[PDB]
């Protein structure tokens, strides 16, 4: 197909849940066991083929540490989609993700497409967040949910493509 679409996507979530790893996996096909905490935000782009449309993602990978919270609107204002990420081995990171969802629903664009990534799914032997519980939470709040693993690549391209399809 010859159609071309471009959308702005932002990743939000508690520090260490794997936002930069998810983006690096999707954009560069890389995964680093040792990834330094992001300062402010990082920016990357990736273009994919969806049906007869070429979709380019402009991705803002935000730093999740609390000291950067006040910068968040600079990154999510104007975003057409967001991926809120938590770590399936850490319930507090899941609670933090719910508060990011609330902030987006109240302060971001009214028509933003919000996805929820239960990341580090490869560490299911240390699970702290029940899959069905997270799926129900996502369903009830109109969020596109998938468990992902930036480490193994599980559902990484899938979550970005599912978002593209809904934009
Ligand atoms: N097992 C596993 N480790 C992962 C996964 N995704 C990220 N990690 C690891 O978790 C750590 C932090 O990842 P990183 O992507 O930097 O997290 P972040 O959410 O960007 N942190 P910040 O918000 O501070 O920038 C790294 O050691 C990374 O290798 C995953 O899917 N599985
Ligand atoms: Mg990061």
UniProtKB/Swiss-Prot annotation:
Main location: membrane
Obligatory cofactor(s): Mg(2+)
Enzyme Commission designation: 3.6.5.2
One term of GO molecular function: G protein activity
GO biological process: amyloid-beta clearance by transcytosis; canonical Wnt signaling pathway; early endosome to late endosome transport; endocytosis; intracellular protein transport; modulation by host of viral process; phagocytosis; positive regulation of exocytosis
Keywords, comma-separated and alphabetical: Cell membrane, Cell projection, Cytoplasm, Cytoplasmic vesicle, Endocytosis, Endosome, Glycoprotein, GTP-binding, Hydrolase, Lipoprotein, Membrane, Nucleotide-binding, Phagocytosis, Phosphoprotein, Prenylation, Protein transport, Transport
Consequence the record notes for mutating residue 106 to E: No effect on RABEP1 binding affinity
Resulting phenotype, residue 40 to Q: Strongly decreases ZFYVE20 binding affinity
Membrane topology, record value: Lipid-anchor
Catalytic activity: GTP + H2O = GDP + phosphate + H(+)
Glycosylation sites recorded in the entry for this protein: 106
Stated consequence of mutating residue 43 to A: Strongly decreases RABEP1 and ZFYVE20 binding affinity
Residues bound to Mg(2+): 20, 38
Motif window: Switch 2: 63-79
Regulation of catalytic or functional activity: Regulated by guanine nucleotide exchange factors (GEFs) including RINL, which promote the exchange of bound GDP for free GTP. Regulated by GTPase activating proteins (GAPs) which increase the GTP hydrolysis activity. Inhibited by GDP dissociation inhibitors (GDIs).
Comment block on domains: Switch 1, switch 2 and the interswitch regions are characteristic of Rab GTPases and mediate the interactions with Rab downstream effectors. The switch regions undergo conformational changes upon nucleotide binding which drive interaction with specific sets of effector proteins, with most effectors only binding to GTP-bound Rab.
Family, similarity comment: Belongs to the small GTPase superfamily. Rab family.
Protein name in UniProt: Ras-related protein Rab-5A
Gene: RAB5A
Shown stretch of the complete protein: 15 to 181 of 215
């Amino acid at each position: 197909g010859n159609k071309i679409c471009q959308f702005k996507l932002v990743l939000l979530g508690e520090s260490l849940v794997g936002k930069s790893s998810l983006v690096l996996r999707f954009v560069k096909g890389q995964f680093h066991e040792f990834q330094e905490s992001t300062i402010g935000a990082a920016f990357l782009t990736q273009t994919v083929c969806l049906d007869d449309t070429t979709v380019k993602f402009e991705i803002w990978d935000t730093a999740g540490q609390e000291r950067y919270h006040s910068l968040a609107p600079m990154y999510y204002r104007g975003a057409q989609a967001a991926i809120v990420v938590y770590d399936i081995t850490n319930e507090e990171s899941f609670a933090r993700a719910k508060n990011w969802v609330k902030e987006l629903q109240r302060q971001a664009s009214p028509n933003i497409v919000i996805a929820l990534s239960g990341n580090k799914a490869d560490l299911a032997n240390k699970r702290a967040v029940d899959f069905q519980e997270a799926q129900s939470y996502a369903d009830d709040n109109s969020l596109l949910f998938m468990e992902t693993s930036a480490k193994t690549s599980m559902n990484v391209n899938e979550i970005f493509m599912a978002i593209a399809k809904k934009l």
